[PDB]
Amino acid sequence: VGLSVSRVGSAAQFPGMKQVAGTLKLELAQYREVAAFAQFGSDLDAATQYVLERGARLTEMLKQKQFAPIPIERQTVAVYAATKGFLDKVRVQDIVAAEEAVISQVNPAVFKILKANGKITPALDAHLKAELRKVKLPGA
Amino acid sequence: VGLSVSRVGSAAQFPGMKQVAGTLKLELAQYREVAAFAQFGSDLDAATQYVLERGARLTEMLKQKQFAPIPIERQTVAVYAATKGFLDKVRVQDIVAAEEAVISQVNPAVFKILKANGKITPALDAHLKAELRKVKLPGA
Amino acid sequence: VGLSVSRVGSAAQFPGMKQVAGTLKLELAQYREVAAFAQFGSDLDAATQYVLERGARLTEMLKQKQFAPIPIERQTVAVYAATKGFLDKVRVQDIVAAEEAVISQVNPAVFKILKANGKITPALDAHLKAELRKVKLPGA
Amino acid sequence: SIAELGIYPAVDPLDSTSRMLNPNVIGAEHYNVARGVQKVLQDYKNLQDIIAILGMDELSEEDKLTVARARKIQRFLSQPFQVAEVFTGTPGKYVDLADTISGFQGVLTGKYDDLPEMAFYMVGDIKEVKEKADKMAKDIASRKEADNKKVSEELK
Amino acid sequence: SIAELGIYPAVDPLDSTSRMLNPNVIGAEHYNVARGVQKVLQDYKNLQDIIA
Amino acid sequence: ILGMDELSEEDKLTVARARKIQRFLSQPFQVAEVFTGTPGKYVDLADTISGF
Amino acid sequence: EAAAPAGPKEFTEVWNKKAPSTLIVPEFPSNYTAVKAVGEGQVHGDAFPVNFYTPHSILSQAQKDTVVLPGVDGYFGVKASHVPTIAQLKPGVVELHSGAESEKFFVSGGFAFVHPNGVTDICVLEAATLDQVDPAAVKSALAAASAAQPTDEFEQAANRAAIELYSALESAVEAKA
Amino acid sequence: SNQAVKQRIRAIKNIGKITKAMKMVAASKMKNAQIAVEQSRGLVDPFVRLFGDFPAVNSNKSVVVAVTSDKGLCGGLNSNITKYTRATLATTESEGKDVVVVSIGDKGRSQLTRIESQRYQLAIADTYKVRVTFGQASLIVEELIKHNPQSYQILFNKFRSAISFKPTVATILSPDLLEKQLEDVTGNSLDAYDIEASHERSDVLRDLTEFHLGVTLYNAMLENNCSEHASRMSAMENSTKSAGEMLGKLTLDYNRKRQATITTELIEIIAGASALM
Amino acid sequence: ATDLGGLQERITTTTKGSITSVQAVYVPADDLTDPAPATTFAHLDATTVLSR
């Protein structure tokens, strides 16, 4: 993600993805800076460990399986559930199932208005904050 | 000793030298790999350190002055005297005189039947087990 | 100064400079030995600490502006003024202004004897040591 | 790089060879001293990376004895040349072969762990390292009184 | 590098690939074991610049 | 690695002067006023030497 | 009786004639303290220097005019030019007055020295002040301290220390203002 | 040859990250261990104004203590007080006394038995793993008074600043075995104090010397721990600097070999084409 | 050098006017001693580094 460039993607992506992907790529810009530093997890500052844990959340969030491409609204709400709150308690081993859980258990009428409007309106933002807390996450 | 290969294997080896050679290879393989940490001689670990000084005995064993090839019986006796631990008392820096003391102080009738028998027979591995103790080794 | 060599000009330098810059390149050598090991801030031996701010004075004495060459007599007095300790305890950000003070205040008949003899004669260094004590160095 | 260290003649001792370096040609103690000097220098060359990136302060004691003896025999292999005395200022030092064997055996066994490193730099043999040691340890005590002027107003 | 550790066959686990490594083909409970083995060995390869 | 109040007060002044130098090197551009609104400013040389 | 003048002045001598010269003479803890015990002054009238110490904290370096210390022979009070006293303290409350206001710490036990220059040094281990103690778990502990009498003298001494600490912590928690 | 340089570059570029990381880690440990050290500095003062400071005593039995580090990436700190403890053992030993040598830290047992093997009798280690407390220092003190000496010498590096660590020697005397004898100044210097103990002066001096040994051992191994962190923060910043310089020279040489490689294969292709055409 | 020089030597100040050329400089393989920047930099009188 540090070496792959796209010199078009400034105002050539999904607007609901653009609301979130700036934060996602700036959180990963700190994780790639501190990652190879703090390979050990013993004696850590409370600011560096937080961006380490966030980068480890986003890293397991972005990986997906083969021959199953995701619609754009579903990955929009998955990166919204990752770069906001709603996932800061699942470890790393369960985010592969936790994004599937937040995809499946969320009332899927948010996807239709997300896809038709194109962006995250504040009404849909508030229903998306509300819809993401009632998801039974498989972190156990 | 790492990069040196022989793709005939031990199929074309003198017997008896084969009985000591797998051991010599194995301890040299341990001595090579627990090295690149031997610069820190401070922390005595007593499991790696025995391996390090044993491999030092074996590495000092295989040094050899030129234009004087050794007969194969004296070679396998000199390696048997290091892989059975007879030389653990002598220091690292003084085995090339200790091996010469071993070779010139055992009876010359050990080799006359080690060459003829082809391998270290059970009627011989306890003869020289006692012959290797009745000689004096230059080192305390 | 360590790499810059000239094995052909040695028998081709100004004999007044040959006897005062034989001291200059050796004291710059020790300054090259101290600052290449004591950059850690380990300890000040208080004699190697002397030659660190002596060699810093010889470096700042050897700076020069552009398109302003100096005659060889006004060079070897500024090297005489620095290696003989007359420029000592002048602060190192004054020596550009201080070696301009040396050449300006020393009697111009000094440079006329030194150019013509080509050599700091015994009658002159006793005189030139005097004229350097009567020098209004900046900063005192 | 050996020339950039100031060691002249800049002979790499771990890359120069001879067919006379044979115990049946030059003798036993000469060949043994030469192989011991090359063992110390190789053991120091194998310690260059960790000395560079971790510091001198983290080796073992036998390692940092090896480093000190190797820094002694690196300086001791240098020598002032009689054809270089016109652009150096040092007199040239023809060293006899027995003097070289005796001095390097002295540094190898440990008779000279007490001298500084720069006592060995650009000297003839093992007497001149001790002469230069007292020449450079009288120099740190070389502080005389009153500046010895006799120049203030010399009469005519 | 697998061979001078004495490991035979000296097959690099993090360089040997197959088209039979789909979960559709060899099943999921084999593919998960293989992917976990590769994950563990790659993280050990990352930790070897500290633990050496 | 240590903190903002670790260093001296002259270091505080070096931080303050450099942070207002880093902002004073910024400039609104006359060609970019069509999509940033604020008019651009052609600064002469005699003004920026005096300002800095 | 005074036949061995030891000290950092004189350790320098025997060290400099017997240690290698690359090491300077090592420092000593007396080089880091400014205030001695027999020296002149540091009383000036009414308020004397009190130094309250624990291993993990410094609780008072300020000048106080009277200190109430809980010695093993009872709570005594230290006025300005008090007699020099090395006093072993039992579990009790230390009151450092300055006027109307005072700081009351309950301590765990540990000595308190008064020096011939008026410098007072309270040196306890755990100084748990009275507004951070609970009044409920003290009885839960001294109940077992009253009940348990073992066969060994070691836990006997531990239980006696337990009851003399907990009983003193009783008397200084109900009768507080 | 031209690939092994590309792996050496990645190795040195990773070492320049690991050492920068642990430089920041040692800085974070140093900034919060300095807090405990300058609070622990208080309690050592009443004992050194009450009992004085007598290093050069005529003890017939001594226990020296060299307070070293556990992790061994400190940079000449542990061998500094090894030089100091072989200098102070060559200062008191001139009269035929018994000396016990103990050490706190694994870098003490690995560097004290090299200079002296027979008097070394005890190795305390794994001290700084969780934290350093006073119950731990007092347990170490009780295991020191398992022997019955007339003096105790503590060797430690005192955290003067983040740059200077002055090696301090600290002395404690056994109570009436040597402490009452060293105070006799035409009478005594301790008779001015009125003992308010439950028992006599020898028992309160025994308890006072145990408490003094405990607080100087606690302060000694706090000062040495945070000076260890400061020398690690300064010793991994001369390490990442040298690993950046080595990486820069490796990148320059790799670029030279890269350009020479492209020219070499290009010249061979041109020669093979001109040998036909 | 001759092709780059024949381009860049026509960008001068004459007596009648001047051409001032701002040239975007790409550095191949992040190597400043590669012959295309090492020949291009011999002509440049100023560098204007735009950093992220």
From TrEMBL, chains A, B, C:
Domain ATP synthase alpha subunit C-terminal: 13-134
Localization: Mitochondrion inner membrane
Record: residues binding ADP 2: R7
Amino-acid positions noted as binding ADP 1 in the UniProt annotation, renumbered to this chain: S6, R7
Residues annotated for ATP binding in this entry: Q64, K65, Q66
Assigned protein family: Belongs to the ATPase alpha/beta chains family.
Job of this protein: Mitochondrial membrane ATP synthase (F(1)F(0) ATP synthase or Complex V) produces ATP from ADP in the presence of a proton gradient across the membrane which is generated by electron transport complexes of the respiratory chain. F-type ATPases consist of two structural domains, F(1) - containing the extramembraneous catalytic core, and F(0) - containing the membrane proton channel, linked together by a central stalk and a peripheral stalk. During catalysis, ATP synthesis in the catalytic domain of F(1) is coupled via a rotary mechanism of the central stalk subunits to proton translocation.
Protein name: ATP synthase subunit alpha
Species of provenance: Polytomella sp. Pringsheim 198.80
Residues of the full protein shown: 423 to 562 of 562
From TrEMBL, chain G:
Annotated compartments: Mitochondrion inner membrane
Coarse class of the protein's main subcellular location: mitochondrion
InterPro entries in the record: ATP_synth_F1_dsu/esu, ATP_synth_F1_dsu/esu_N, ATPsynth_dsu/esu_N
GO terms for cellular component: mitochondrial inner membrane; proton-transporting ATP synthase complex
GO molecular function, one term: proton-transporting ATP synthase activity, rotational mechanism
Pfam families on file: ATP-synt_DE_N
Keywords: Hydrogen ion transport, Ion transport, Membrane, Mitochondrion, Mitochondrion inner membrane, Transit peptide, Transport
Domain ATP synthase F1 complex delta/epsilon subunit N-terminal: 50-120
Protein family according to the UniProt entry: Belongs to the ATPase epsilon chain family.
The name this protein goes by in its record: Mitochondrial ATP synthase subunit delta
Organism: Polytomella sp. Pringsheim 198.80
Automatic annotation (TrEMBL), chain H:
Gene name tied to this protein: atp3
Chief location of this protein within or outside the cell: mitochondrion
Places the protein is found: Mitochondrion inner membrane
GO molecular function: proton-transporting ATP synthase activity, rotational mechanism
HAMAP family to which the protein is assigned, alphabetical: ATP_synth_gamma_bact
CDD domains recorded: F1-ATPase_gamma
NCBIfam families on file: ATPsyn_F1gamma
Membrane topology label: Peripheral membrane protein
Name of protein: F-ATPase gamma subunit
Entry keyword set: ATP synthesis, CF(1), Hydrogen ion transport, Ion transport, Membrane, Mitochondrion, Mitochondrion inner membrane, Signal, Transport
Sequence similarity: Belongs to the ATPase gamma chain family.
The organism's place on the tree of life at top rank: Eukaryota
GO terms for cellular component: mitochondrial inner membrane; proton-transporting ATP synthase complex
UniProtKB/TrEMBL annotation, chain I:
Lineage: superkingdom: Eukaryota
Binding partners and assembly: F-type ATPases have 2 components, CF(1) - the catalytic core - and CF(0) - the membrane proton channel. CF(1) and CF(0) have multiple subunits. F-type ATPases have 2 components, CF(1) - the catalytic core - and CF(0) - the membrane proton channel. CF(1) has five subunits: alpha(3), beta(3), gamma(1), delta(1), epsilon(1). CF(0) has three main subunits: a, b and c.
Protein name: ATP synthase subunit beta
Family designation: Belongs to the ATPase alpha/beta chains family.
Subcellular localization: Mitochondrion inner membrane
Species of the source: Polytomella sp. Pringsheim 198.80
Full-length numbering of the shown residues: 315 to 366 of 574
Biological function: Produces ATP from ADP in the presence of a proton gradient across the membrane.
